[PDB]
Amino acid sequence: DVQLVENGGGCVKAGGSLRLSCAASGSTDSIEYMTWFRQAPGKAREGVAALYTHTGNTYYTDSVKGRFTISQDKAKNMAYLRMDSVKSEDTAIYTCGATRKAVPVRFALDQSSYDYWGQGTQVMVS
Amino acid sequence: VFGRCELAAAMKRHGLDNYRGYSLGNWVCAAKFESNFNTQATNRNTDGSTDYGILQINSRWWCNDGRTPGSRNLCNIPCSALLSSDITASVNCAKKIVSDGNGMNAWVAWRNRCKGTDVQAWIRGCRL
């Protein structure tokens, strides 16, 4: 019984630093992975920055390599995704998925694997 | 129900010892808190996935039962072999799982109890 929420978003010109936040409720202990998925208009939902709550290892797709960083707080059961050097293609709706089971690394960015989702937060680049 | 010392000796024989930088105590504790030293133990999941073997390997991602939709079957072996009394296949695919990259953190019992504890005490007093 984990509900995912998202905070932040909005218009951020190129190069602007955007701080997206995500939180978990209910039985947050069972959560294993936290990932951000961008639902770009006209494109299928795809992962952006996968993460493992316990180890803390962060996995990122090629596009956002070296620009976006994701970290979480154990006490608050929240994960926030830093953004930097944004470009035109970054405009999309970002969804903070979560799972109650240990997914493999190769499937950490897979949307089907995750058993939880939250209301996506729109991100626009001026 | 295999003996605690006997189970530790079996794990040592199978080569699980000194794998991914974990001692025998971690594996013994994980087995004890996953199946209470009972390899025949079987558990289901809310999603419908099934767990077989002493280490309770999940069917969705690890073993190919054929009853779980979209199974990644990483073990590449039938879940029945894991359900078999012998722990050879369980040891092999546990090596594979701990080699995933996240270590023994994948197993819930290990994180809950065998993480940051005196796991080595499990193999104490066993003449191994």
Side-chain angles (χ1 to χ4, degrees), chain A, chain B residues 1-11 13-31 33-128:
Chain A
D1 189 358
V2 190
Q3 313 183 1
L4 281 293
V5 310
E6 293 75 0
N7 304 337
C11 183
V12 298
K13 193 183 178 182
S17 170
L18 180 57
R19 294 179 66 188
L20 295 173
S21 292
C22 183
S25 45
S27 300
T28 64
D29 55 357
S30 74
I31 286 302
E32 300 306 299
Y33 280 78
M34 301 215 188
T35 300
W36 279 96
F37 310 78
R38 57 173 61 180
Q39 181 75 84
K43 280 82 174 176
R45 181 165 68 184
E46 54 206 339
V48 165
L51 159 75
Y52 197 58
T53 53
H54 282 97
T55 64
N57 290 318
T58 60
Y59 295 98
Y60 305 89
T61 187
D62 292 0
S63 304
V64 298
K65 214 68 173 177
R67 294 160 60 243
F68 299 172
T69 62
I70 190 170
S71 87
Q72 78 293 6
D73 186 74
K74 278 74 171 171
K76 302 290 100 175
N77 294 137
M78 65 180 288
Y80 60 90
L81 169 58
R82 273 282 284 281
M83 293 177 71
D84 293 296
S85 310
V86 306
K87 322 181 289 193
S88 63
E89 284 74 359
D90 286 354
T91 302
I93 308 104
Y94 290 16
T95 318
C96 165
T99 187
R100 44 161 81 211
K101 265 284 206 164
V103 185
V105 165
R106 69 217 73 184
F107 305 122
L109 285 177
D110 267 11
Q111 55 268 49
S112 72
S113 296
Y114 288 62
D115 308 302
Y116 294 120
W117 293 281
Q119 43 94 20
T121 183
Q122 303 95 359
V123 168
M124 281 145 298
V125 65
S126 168
Chain B
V1 176
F2 294 168
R4 184 156 133 183
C5 298
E6 211 196 320
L7 196 75
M11 293 180 183
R13 289 188 320 91
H14 301 327
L16 197 70
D17 61 303
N18 312 120
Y19 194 101
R20 201 66 265 184
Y22 306 71
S23 72
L24 281 299
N26 292 290
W27 307 108
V28 171
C29 173
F33 294 156
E34 283 167 308
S35 298
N36 176 27
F37 294 165
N38 176 238
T39 300
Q40 283 90 71
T42 58
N43 294 115
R44 294 261 296 183
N45 288 120
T46 60
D47 291 331
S49 300
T50 302
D51 301 2
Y52 285 168
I54 190 167
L55 306 180
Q56 295 300 318
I57 295 92
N58 173 246
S59 59
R60 210 269 185 180
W61 289 280
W62 304 119
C63 69
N64 194 2
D65 44 357
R67 178 170 60 189
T68 306
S71 165
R72 317 302 205 178
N73 77 351
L74 270 295
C75 296
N76 296 114
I77 66 173
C79 306
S80 60
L82 301 203
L83 181 52
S84 82
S85 181
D86 204 2
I87 62 170
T88 44
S90 301
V91 164
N92 294 319
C93 192
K95 287 173 175 286
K96 190 166 163 134
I97 291 153
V98 74
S99 282
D100 204 329
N102 297 89
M104 290 196 78
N105 274 309
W107 291 298
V108 176
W110 180 96
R111 287 197 267 95
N112 295 351
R113 317 297 314 291
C114 319
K115 180 179 206 186
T117 52
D118 199 302
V119 305
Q120 173 294 310
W122 285 84
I123 62 170
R124 199 186 289 129
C126 289
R127 283 56 170 179
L128 310 183

Coordinates of all heavy atoms in Angstrom, one line a residue, chain A residues 32-33 52 54-55 57 59 99-107 110 112-113 115, chain B residues 45-47 51 58 60-62 72 74 96 100-103 105-106 108 111 115:
Chain A
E32 N 11.7 -1.1 -2.8 CA 13.0 -1.5 -3.2 C 13.7 -0.6 -4.2 O 14.8 -0.2 -3.9 CB 13.0 -2.9 -3.8 CG 12.4 -4.0 -2.8 CD 13.1 -4.0 -1.5 OE1 14.3 -4.3 -1.5 OE2 12.4 -3.8 -0.5
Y33 N 13.0 -0.2 -5.2 CA 13.6 0.7 -6.2 C 12.7 1.9 -6.3 O 11.5 1.9 -6.2 CB 13.7 0.0 -7.6 CG 14.9 -0.9 -7.8 CD1 14.9 -2.2 -7.3 CD2 16.0 -0.5 -8.5 CE1 15.9 -3.0 -7.4 CE2 17.1 -1.3 -8.7 CZ 17.0 -2.6 -8.2 OH 18.1 -3.4 -8.3
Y52 N 18.3 2.4 -6.1 CA 18.0 1.4 -5.1 C 18.0 2.0 -3.7 O 19.0 2.7 -3.4 CB 19.0 0.2 -5.2 CG 18.5 -1.0 -4.5 CD1 17.3 -1.6 -4.9 CD2 19.3 -1.6 -3.5 CE1 16.9 -2.8 -4.2 CE2 18.8 -2.8 -2.9 CZ 17.6 -3.4 -3.2 OH 17.2 -4.5 -2.6
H54 N 18.3 0.9 -0.6 CA 19.2 0.4 0.4 C 20.6 0.7 0.0 O 21.4 1.4 0.7 CB 19.0 -1.1 0.7 CG 17.8 -1.4 1.6 ND1 16.6 -1.7 1.1 CD2 17.7 -1.4 2.9 CE1 15.7 -1.9 2.1 NE2 16.4 -1.7 3.2
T55 N 21.1 0.1 -1.1 CA 22.5 0.3 -1.5 C 22.7 1.8 -1.9 O 23.8 2.3 -1.6 CB 22.8 -0.6 -2.7 OG1 21.9 -0.2 -3.9 CG2 22.5 -2.1 -2.4
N57 N 22.8 2.8 -5.0 CA 23.3 2.8 -6.4 C 22.3 3.5 -7.3 O 21.1 3.3 -7.3 CB 23.6 1.4 -6.9 CG 24.8 0.8 -6.2 OD1 25.8 1.5 -5.9 ND2 24.6 -0.5 -5.9
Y59 N 21.3 4.5 -11.3 CA 21.5 4.1 -12.7 C 20.7 5.1 -13.6 O 19.5 5.4 -13.3 CB 20.9 2.7 -13.0 CG 21.7 1.6 -12.3 CD1 21.3 1.1 -11.1 CD2 22.9 1.2 -12.8 CE1 22.0 0.1 -10.4 CE2 23.6 0.2 -12.1 CZ 23.2 -0.3 -11.0 OH 23.9 -1.3 -10.3
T99 N 8.6 0.1 -6.7 CA 8.3 -1.3 -6.7 C 8.5 -1.8 -5.3 O 9.2 -1.3 -4.5 CB 9.2 -2.0 -7.6 OG1 8.8 -3.4 -7.7 CG2 10.6 -2.0 -7.1
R100 N 7.7 -2.9 -5.0 CA 7.8 -3.6 -3.7 C 8.7 -4.8 -3.7 O 8.8 -5.5 -2.7 CB 6.4 -4.0 -3.2 CG 5.5 -4.6 -4.3 CD 4.4 -5.4 -3.7 NE 3.2 -4.5 -3.3 CZ 2.4 -4.8 -2.3 NH1 2.5 -5.9 -1.6 NH2 1.4 -3.9 -2.0
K101 N 9.3 -5.1 -4.8 CA 10.2 -6.2 -5.0 C 11.5 -5.9 -5.6 O 11.7 -4.8 -6.2 CB 9.5 -7.3 -5.8 CG 8.7 -8.3 -5.1 CD 9.7 -9.4 -4.5 CE 9.0 -10.7 -4.2 NZ 9.9 -11.8 -4.0
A102 N 12.5 -6.7 -5.3 CA 13.9 -6.5 -5.8 C 14.0 -6.8 -7.3 O 14.0 -7.9 -7.7 CB 14.9 -7.3 -5.0
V103 N 14.0 -5.7 -8.1 CA 14.2 -5.9 -9.5 C 15.6 -6.0 -9.9 O 16.5 -5.4 -9.2 CB 13.5 -4.7 -10.3 CG1 13.5 -4.9 -11.8 CG2 12.1 -4.5 -9.8
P104 N 16.0 -6.7 -11.0 CA 17.4 -6.7 -11.4 C 17.8 -5.3 -11.9 O 17.0 -4.5 -12.3 CB 17.4 -7.8 -12.5 CG 16.2 -8.6 -12.2 CD 15.2 -7.7 -11.7
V105 N 19.1 -5.2 -12.0 CA 19.7 -3.9 -12.5 C 19.3 -3.6 -13.9 O 18.9 -2.5 -14.3 CB 21.2 -3.9 -12.4 CG1 21.8 -2.8 -13.2 CG2 21.6 -3.8 -10.9
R106 N 19.3 -4.6 -14.8 CA 19.0 -4.4 -16.2 C 17.5 -4.0 -16.4 O 17.2 -3.3 -17.3 CB 19.3 -5.7 -17.0 CG 18.4 -6.8 -16.7 CD 19.1 -8.1 -16.7 NE 20.0 -8.3 -15.6 CZ 20.8 -9.3 -15.4 NH1 20.9 -10.3 -16.3 NH2 21.6 -9.4 -14.3
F107 N 16.6 -4.4 -15.4 CA 15.2 -4.1 -15.5 C 14.9 -2.9 -14.5 O 13.7 -2.7 -14.3 CB 14.4 -5.3 -15.2 CG 14.7 -6.5 -16.0 CD1 15.1 -7.7 -15.5 CD2 14.5 -6.4 -17.4 CE1 15.3 -8.8 -16.3 CE2 14.8 -7.5 -18.2 CZ 15.2 -8.7 -17.7
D110 N 12.9 -0.4 -16.4 CA 11.7 -0.9 -17.0 C 10.4 -0.5 -16.3 O 10.3 -0.6 -15.1 CB 11.7 -2.4 -17.1 CG 12.3 -2.9 -18.4 OD1 12.9 -2.1 -19.2 OD2 12.2 -4.1 -18.7
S112 N 7.3 -1.6 -16.8 CA 6.4 -2.7 -16.4 C 6.8 -3.4 -15.1 O 5.9 -3.9 -14.4 CB 6.5 -3.8 -17.6 OG 7.7 -4.5 -17.6
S113 N 8.1 -3.4 -14.8 CA 8.6 -4.1 -13.6 C 8.0 -3.4 -12.3 O 7.6 -4.1 -11.4 CB 10.1 -4.1 -13.5 OG 10.6 -4.9 -14.6
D115 N 5.7 -1.8 -9.6 CA 4.3 -2.1 -9.2 C 3.6 -0.9 -8.6 O 2.4 -1.0 -8.2 CB 4.3 -3.2 -8.2 CG 5.0 -4.4 -8.7 OD1 4.7 -5.0 -9.8 OD2 6.0 -4.9 -8.0
Chain B
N45 N 3.2 -15.3 -3.7 CA 3.3 -13.8 -3.6 C 1.9 -13.2 -4.0 O 1.1 -13.8 -4.6 CB 4.4 -13.3 -4.6 CG 5.8 -13.7 -4.1 OD1 6.5 -14.4 -4.8 ND2 6.1 -13.2 -3.0
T46 N 1.8 -11.9 -3.6 CA 0.6 -11.2 -3.9 C 0.4 -11.1 -5.4 O -0.8 -11.2 -5.9 CB 0.6 -9.8 -3.2 OG1 1.7 -9.1 -3.7 CG2 0.7 -9.9 -1.7
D47 N 1.4 -10.8 -6.1 CA 1.4 -10.8 -7.6 C 1.1 -12.1 -8.2 O 0.9 -12.2 -9.4 CB 2.7 -10.1 -8.1 CG 2.8 -8.7 -7.8 OD1 1.8 -8.0 -7.6 OD2 4.0 -8.2 -7.6
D51 N 7.7 -18.8 -4.6 CA 9.1 -18.9 -4.0 C 9.3 -20.4 -3.7 O 8.5 -21.0 -3.0 CB 9.3 -18.0 -2.8 CG 9.0 -16.6 -3.1 OD1 8.7 -16.2 -4.3 OD2 9.2 -15.7 -2.2
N58 N 12.6 -16.0 -5.8 CA 11.3 -15.5 -6.5 C 11.2 -16.1 -7.9 O 12.2 -16.1 -8.6 CB 11.3 -14.0 -6.5 CG 10.1 -13.5 -7.3 OD1 10.3 -12.8 -8.3 ND2 8.9 -13.7 -6.8
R60 N 9.3 -14.7 -10.3 CA 9.1 -13.7 -11.4 C 10.3 -13.4 -12.1 O 10.3 -13.4 -13.4 CB 8.5 -12.4 -10.7 CG 7.6 -11.6 -11.7 CD 8.4 -10.6 -12.4 NE 7.5 -9.7 -13.3 CZ 8.0 -8.8 -14.0 NH1 9.3 -8.5 -14.2 NH2 7.1 -8.0 -14.7
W61 N 11.5 -13.2 -11.4 CA 12.7 -12.8 -12.1 C 13.8 -13.8 -12.2 O 14.7 -13.7 -13.0 CB 13.3 -11.6 -11.3 CG 12.5 -10.3 -11.4 CD1 12.5 -9.4 -12.5 CD2 11.6 -9.7 -10.5 NE1 11.7 -8.4 -12.3 CE2 11.1 -8.5 -11.1 CE3 11.1 -10.1 -9.2 CZ2 10.2 -7.7 -10.4 CZ3 10.2 -9.3 -8.6 CH2 9.7 -8.1 -9.2
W62 N 13.7 -14.9 -11.4 CA 14.8 -15.8 -11.2 C 14.6 -17.2 -11.8 O 15.4 -17.6 -12.7 CB 15.1 -15.9 -9.7 CG 15.4 -14.6 -9.0 CD1 14.6 -14.1 -8.0 CD2 16.4 -13.7 -9.3 NE1 15.2 -12.9 -7.7 CE2 16.3 -12.6 -8.5 CE3 17.4 -13.7 -10.3 CZ2 17.1 -11.5 -8.5 CZ3 18.3 -12.6 -10.3 CH2 18.1 -11.5 -9.4
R72 N 11.3 -13.3 -16.0 CA 12.6 -13.1 -16.5 C 13.5 -14.3 -16.3 O 14.6 -14.3 -17.0 CB 13.3 -11.9 -15.8 CG 12.3 -10.7 -15.7 CD 11.8 -10.2 -17.0 NE 11.4 -8.8 -17.0 CZ 10.9 -8.1 -18.0 NH1 10.8 -8.7 -19.2 NH2 10.6 -6.8 -17.8
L74 N 15.9 -15.5 -14.6 CA 17.3 -15.3 -14.6 C 18.1 -16.6 -14.3 O 19.1 -16.9 -14.9 CB 17.7 -14.2 -13.7 CG 17.8 -12.8 -14.3 CD1 18.9 -12.6 -15.3 CD2 16.4 -12.3 -14.8
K96 N 24.4 -16.3 -8.4 CA 24.0 -15.4 -9.5 C 23.3 -14.1 -9.0 O 23.6 -13.0 -9.5 CB 23.1 -16.1 -10.5 CG 22.8 -15.3 -11.8 CD 22.2 -16.2 -12.9 CE 21.6 -15.3 -14.0 NZ 22.0 -15.8 -15.3
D100 N 24.3 -9.9 -9.0 CA 23.6 -9.0 -9.7 C 24.2 -7.6 -9.6 O 24.3 -6.8 -10.6 CB 22.1 -8.9 -9.3 CG 21.2 -8.4 -10.4 OD1 21.6 -7.6 -11.2 OD2 20.0 -8.8 -10.4
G101 N 24.7 -7.2 -8.5 CA 25.3 -5.9 -8.3 C 24.9 -5.2 -7.0 O 25.7 -4.5 -6.4
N102 N 23.7 -5.6 -6.4 CA 23.3 -5.1 -5.2 C 23.6 -5.9 -4.0 O 23.2 -5.6 -2.9 CB 21.7 -4.9 -5.2 CG 21.3 -3.8 -6.3 OD1 21.1 -4.2 -7.4 ND2 21.2 -2.6 -5.8
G103 N 24.3 -7.0 -4.2 CA 24.7 -7.9 -3.1 C 23.5 -8.7 -2.6 O 22.5 -8.9 -3.2
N105 N 21.5 -7.6 -0.5 CA 20.4 -6.8 -0.2 C 19.1 -7.2 -0.9 O 18.0 -6.7 -0.5 CB 20.7 -5.3 -0.5 CG 21.5 -4.6 0.6 OD1 21.1 -4.6 1.7 ND2 22.6 -4.0 0.2
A106 N 19.2 -8.0 -1.9 CA 18.0 -8.4 -2.6 C 17.1 -9.2 -1.7 O 15.8 -9.1 -1.8 CB 18.4 -9.2 -3.9
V108 N 15.0 -10.2 1.4 CA 14.4 -9.4 2.4 C 14.9 -9.8 3.8 O 15.2 -9.0 4.7 CB 12.9 -9.4 2.3 CG1 12.2 -8.7 3.5 CG2 12.4 -8.9 1.0
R111 N 18.4 -8.5 4.7 CA 18.4 -7.1 5.1 C 17.8 -6.9 6.5 O 18.3 -6.1 7.3 CB 17.6 -6.2 4.1 CG 18.4 -6.1 2.7 CD 17.8 -4.9 1.9 NE 16.8 -5.4 1.0 CZ 15.5 -5.5 1.2 NH1 14.9 -5.0 2.4 NH2 14.6 -5.9 0.3
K115 N 21.7 -8.3 8.1 CA 22.5 -7.2 7.7 C 23.0 -6.4 8.9 O 22.2 -6.1 9.8 CB 21.6 -6.3 6.8 CG 22.4 -5.0 6.3 CD 21.5 -4.2 5.4 CE 22.3 -3.3 4.5 NZ 21.4 -2.4 3.7

